[PDB]
Paper text:
Fe/αKG oxygenases utilize αKG as a co-substrate and Fe(II) as a cofactor. Through the oxidative decarboxylation of αKG, a reactive Fe(IV)-oxo intermediate is generated to activate a selective aliphatic C–H bond, which is normally difficult to cleave due to high bond-dissociation energy, and then oxidative products are generated following radical recombination.
It catalyzes two oxidation steps to form emervaridone C from andiconin D. In the active site, 1 or 6 is located on the opposite side of the facial triad in an almost identical fashion, indicating that the size of the A-ring does not affect the binding mode. The active site hydrophobic residues, Ile63, Phe133, and Ile231, are located within van der Waals distances of the B/C-ring, suggesting that a hydrophobic surface facilitates the substrate binding. In contrast, the D/E-rings of 1 and 6 are tightly fixed by several hydrophilic residues located on the bottom surface of the active site cavity: the carbonyl oxygen of the E-ring interacts with Ser114, while the carbonyl oxygen of the D-ring interacts with the main chains of Leu199 and Thr148 via water molecules. Hydrogen abstraction at C11 of 1 by the ferryl species first generates a radical, which undergoes recombination to cleave the C–C bond between C4’ and C3’ and bridge C4’ and C11, but not through the hydroxylated intermediate.
Residue numbers in the entry:
A (entry chain D): 4 to 60, 70 to 280
B (entry chain C): 4 to 280
The structure:
Amino acid sequence: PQLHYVPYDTPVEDVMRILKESGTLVIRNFLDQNTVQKVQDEVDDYVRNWNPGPKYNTKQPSNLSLMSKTYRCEVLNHPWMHAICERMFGPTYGDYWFNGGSILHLEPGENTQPIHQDHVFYQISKWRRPTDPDLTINFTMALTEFTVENGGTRVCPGSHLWENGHASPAEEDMVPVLMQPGDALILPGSMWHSAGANRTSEYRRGFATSFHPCHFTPIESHHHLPREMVEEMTPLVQKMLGFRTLNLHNNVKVWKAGEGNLEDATGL
Amino acid sequence: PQLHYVPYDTPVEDVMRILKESGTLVIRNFLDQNTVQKVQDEVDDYVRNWNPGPKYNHDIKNVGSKTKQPSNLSLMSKTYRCEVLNHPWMHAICERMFGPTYGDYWFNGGSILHLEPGENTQPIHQDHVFYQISKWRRPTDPDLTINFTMALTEFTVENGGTRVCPGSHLWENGHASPAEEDMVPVLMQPGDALILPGSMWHSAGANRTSEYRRGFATSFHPCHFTPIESHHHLPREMVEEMTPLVQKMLGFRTLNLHNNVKVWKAGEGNLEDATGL
Ligand SMILES: CC1(C)C(=O)C=C[C@@]2(C)[C@H]1CC[C@@]13C[C@@]4(C)C=C5C(=O)OC[C@]51[C@@](C)(C[C@@H]23)C4=O
Ligand SMILES: O=C(O)CCC(=O)C(=O)O
Ligand SMILES: [Fe+2]
């Protein structure tokens, strides 16, 4: 197992094989630079933080899908995300949906993040085998370059196959993920990973998406979003963000409105 | 293991011990006659116009041709959402079932359980079969869900009263279905409640009487599992009239896992702070 970097046109079956063998990979040019920049600009325009000028004469961050039209209209429809999620969660769990998504702004001077698996906050990971499907998957998209010096994510290829209770990987066995703007690192919930120290004078920036099986409760709820935004989402994204009924592998539906579909009861 | 009939004032510790040992029990006088009638009055028109059988096709064919199982009880019954979902027995048992391992719990689903005269016996099943992760679970682990089946009409053998198999919750996930001769019918007057952890093998019986047999149910499961029923379609003034507890139960508040980790959150803060709840 190694850290693989693959082009955008890599066949899906290759990507899933690499995920199975090494537990992680990078898809180069996952997004164009303009798209990842657009999410940042829309986030900045939402929070409207005051930035002083040279001399004298605001909202708190919320869901990325609420702050960024590009995130909810373009990013969450990314075909690579759904191609992988369909194959990772589909055969066992049926539908999947959005787990959580955050802006990554690694501050200069931040030290090394502890090495961890993402599925630790699922109590059922204590029951899961390494051969089972993953409990969640994360897509980390680079806005700025990911370098060794600015604290880019580090992975340990193959550590997703380790048994439960296995010791953390050694610091020297971590592999830095070197990414250009628009690249994306695929992080299944079983991959041990950590952010490095930002020993530069500039921010390391990016954002994440994550998805997990329909029968698990997402980190984030989007129920507070204005109806106008929901109605402009694709049906796929409406399902991703908790506005539609989900189908289990046994065809039983969850997140229903009574015995019917949520979207029929809300008038979507 | 045995099927026990206990009074309402049974200490919580005895109820938990019976659930651990025998996998089920009946709590008599769980609701009073006033609550039984108020629920029956609020759901009368609803169940009558409801069409029997399952509404959609799925792999669990345990809804017979003469069975009506309508849900959406919080939308259709004020007493369900303002009082029943606040029931102290449900929350006391749920906190001790899911708390130490999962943290918060919330509402899973809740159906009317109405047997028309002539309905045949339901297939014997565990309620948590529709969780893929029950295959991963071991019998000594906490349950994935728990059900409270409350009698609205009397529950008798001949009217299709629920049947359980005490001690079948401790079977391994590969164990075959209990034999029909192994099932124990339960006896309930209106307002009695049968407690059904998701691992207990149970089924409704055949309604060989001239009167329908009706119950209704609540069910709760850990905060990290997706409820079978959403409630985001309910009107806001309904939500504002709920207690904050029932508000959490029905998915209008952020949930706390077992390690200061929150799920069902609005970006950074809580969902309730984002909607002005
Ligand atoms: C298909 C059926 C008949 C079954 O064979 C086994 C489990 C489920 C899927 C029911 C229908 C709906 C549920 C969904 C719910 C959350 C609330 C309902 C209920 O109140 O009674 C049936 C349920 C149950 C107790 C069992 C569960 C439950 O877990
Ligand atoms: O109606 C009953 O008594 C039992 C119904 C049931 O077990 C079920 O629907 O899963
Ligand atoms: Fe059941």
